[PDB]
Design a protein around this ligand. Sequence first.
Ligand SMILES: N[C@H]1CCN(S(=O)(=O)c2ccccc2)C1
Ligand SMILES: N[C@H]1CCN(S(=O)(=O)c2ccccc2)C1
Ligand SMILES: [Zn+2]
Length: 140
Amino acid sequence: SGAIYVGNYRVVNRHLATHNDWANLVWEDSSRDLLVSSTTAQGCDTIARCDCQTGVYYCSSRRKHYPVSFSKPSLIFVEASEYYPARYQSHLMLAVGHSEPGDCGGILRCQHGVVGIVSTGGNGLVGFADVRDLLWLDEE
Ligand SMILES: N[C@H]1CCN(S(=O)(=O)c2ccccc2)C1
Ligand SMILES: N[C@H]1CCN(S(=O)(=O)c2ccccc2)C1
Ligand SMILES: [Zn+2]
């Protein structure tokens, strides 16, 4: 579990979005495993605006933050998981690291702020849904 809180937005994995999220929907994209809902309180997170490929992510199944190198966002085949069939996911970054289904929502951060959230795992990789291209998260 986990979310990003920026302005009056909450960014969650689409597959973990609640009824309240869907009832307050701003934007969602199944291909990216992202959903954004509206919030009452202002959030603490700053979104990175950069093409970093190094950062640190939170792994809830280890209670640990790990430094990782990660691929630039691209369109990647993902094998079946507990929460999706095998399918293509867009805007996905991969690193070598541990990720189980419950790790989804852990933040990946670089020197510029939040890069994305854990979205995929298995076969010794962790996949992150990028948010750095969502410039609208920083206004209105
Ligand atoms: N290698 C490229 C092509 C696929 N990716 S992407 O991150 O899925 C993506 C999709 C659409 C718009 C912008 C980015 C980047
Ligand atoms: N192995 C894959 C096959 C599709 N799922 S699913 O989308 O997580 C799912 C789980 C339970 C009921 C309906 C859908 C995982
Ligand atoms: Zn950066």
